[PDB]
Amino acid sequence: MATFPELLRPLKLGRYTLRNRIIMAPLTRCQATEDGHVPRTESMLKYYEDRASAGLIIAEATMVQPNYTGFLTEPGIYSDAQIEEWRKIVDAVHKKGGLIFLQLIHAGRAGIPEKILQQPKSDQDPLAGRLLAASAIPIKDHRIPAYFAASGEKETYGVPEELTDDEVRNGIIPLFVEGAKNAIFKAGFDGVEIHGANGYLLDAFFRESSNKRQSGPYAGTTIDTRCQLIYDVTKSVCDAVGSDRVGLRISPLNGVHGMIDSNPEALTKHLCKKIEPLSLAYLHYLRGDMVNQQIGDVVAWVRGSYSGVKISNLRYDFEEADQQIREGKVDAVAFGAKFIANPDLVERAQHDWPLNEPRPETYYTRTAVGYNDYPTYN
């Protein structure tokens, strides 16, 4: 008898059928180039192909705005050079019979000032050379880690400029659309995930602590207007590539990057109802707080307010994932740290084999160490 039979069941998701419900969460590993944000092809190809038994891989946060870096050496999806290398990585995943979506990010107030502010403000890009956010409120009491910093030592987050409604509508949204078209039409990704989580640009409009806008369609003053940017980006991307190739990620309780909302339950339920008519491939959420402060039954909120495919994440083991699928609470579960450490995570679930332990101190080496050196089970 199978150990985790519900977790290992196929799942209809958008226009696809996943082989199982073990999802690889998006994981920034910094294995792209600093200058051009081009994937380090063979390194990333090995890493993703080694994990391609996953029902679905969500590839790491990938830049939609030229040079708007939050992680120093993350990949982009805005240039022809990036597209060509991604195409090869995606091909390798497909050769293993896998499926892969690309997570699309704008770092917002988590942009690296020492990189972004040294870019020339000229020509065909009015958003260039500027730190940009919902409001002019910097991330406080959290330094840029040494592994994301331009200098290789801790740096300070900057005070962002408040985006005008014009810049949001005519600058930001079209970048997400173009990025999605590039990813799917040109690189061959099966879909894209909109990054509406973890304190980055879209989440910064979504939650109270970061959106203090007093007017306009993206005002911080109501739940509906705070939901509007996530809706508008997601809708525009759906119109471009098909909603059956679009997912959305949110994190209503995650306190990273000074994120907090006074009413996450009402916020979450409203967003669920607002995005229902989009017929997304899935909604992906962090069910709690990495800081262990903010509490609430996000799984229940989403299940009661959203009729589509629900992917949950954060501190799941196989047993809990299997049980929540069994109970009809979620459709699938994404795993982060366990996929870093276990290329053959799915096979380990099939056999109930023990799991490799992650080494957090080597998450961001930019070499094979702590990246391509976790073995399969003997």
Ligand X SMILES: Cc1cc2nc3c(=O)[nH]c(=O)nc-3n(C[C@H](O)[C@H](O)[C@H](O)COP(=O)(O)O)c2cc1C
Whether the Cβ atoms of residue 241 and residue 295 lie closer than 8 Å to each other: no
Residue number with CB closer to ligand X (131 or 253): 253
Residue 167 has a CB neighbour count (10 Å cut-off) of 16
Q: Is 245 annotated as a binding residue?
A: no
Q: Is 152 annotated as a binding residue?
A: no
Q: Is 51 annotated as a binding residue?
A: no
Q: Which of 64, 67, 85 is nearest to 178 (CA)?
A: 64
Q: How far is the CB of 72 from ligand X (least distance, A)?
A: 13
Q: Which of 162, 32, 144, 34 is nearest to 108 (CA)?
A: 162
Residues catalogued as catalytic: 200
Residue number with CB closer to ligand X (82 or 198): 198
CA dist., res. 151 & res. 170, Å (int)? 33
Q: How far is the CB of 334 from ligand X (least distance, A)?
A: 7
CA dist., res. 191 & res. 47, Å (int)? 19
Q: How far is the CB of 153 from ligand X (least distance, A)?
A: 19
Residue number with CB closer to ligand X (160 or 199): 199
What is the binding site for ligand X (CB under 6 A)?
Answer: 25-28, 60-61, 103, 195, 197-198, 249, 286, 313-315, 335-338, 363
Residue number with CB closer to ligand X (310 or 338): 338
Q: Is 39 annotated as a binding residue?
A: no
Residue number with CB closer to ligand X (95 or 315): 315
Q: Is 300 annotated as a binding residue?
A: no
Q: How far is the CB of 60 from ligand X (least distance, A)?
A: 5
Q: Is 28 annotated as a binding residue?
A: yes
CA dist., res. 16 & res. 344, Å (int)? 22
CA dist., res. 133 & res. 164, Å (int)? 9
Q: Which of 333, 334, 282 is nearest to 306 (CA)?
A: 282
Say how many Å lie between the first and final Cα of the chain, rounded. 22
Q: Which two tokens stand for residue 120?
A: 């020339």
Residue 214 has a CB neighbour count (10 Å cut-off) of 8
Task: Label residue 335 exposed, middle or buried (CB < 10 Å: 0-12, 13-18, 19+).
Answer: buried
CA dist., res. 27 & res. 41, Å (int)? 16
Q: Is 103 annotated as a binding residue?
A: yes
Residues 293-320: b if buried by 16+ CB within 10 A, e if exposed: ebebebbebbbebbebbbbbbbebebee
Q: Is 315 annotated as a binding residue?
A: yes
Q: How far is the CB of 281 from ligand X (least distance, A)?
A: 16
When CB distances to ligand X are compared, the closest residue is: 336
Q: How far is the CB of 190 from ligand X (least distance, A)?
A: 18
CA dist., res. 167 & res. 85, Å (int)? 30
CA dist., res. 245 & res. 273, Å (int)? 20
Residue number with CB closer to ligand X (43 or 219): 43
Annotated binding site for FMN: 26, 28, 61, 103, 249, 313, 315, 336-337
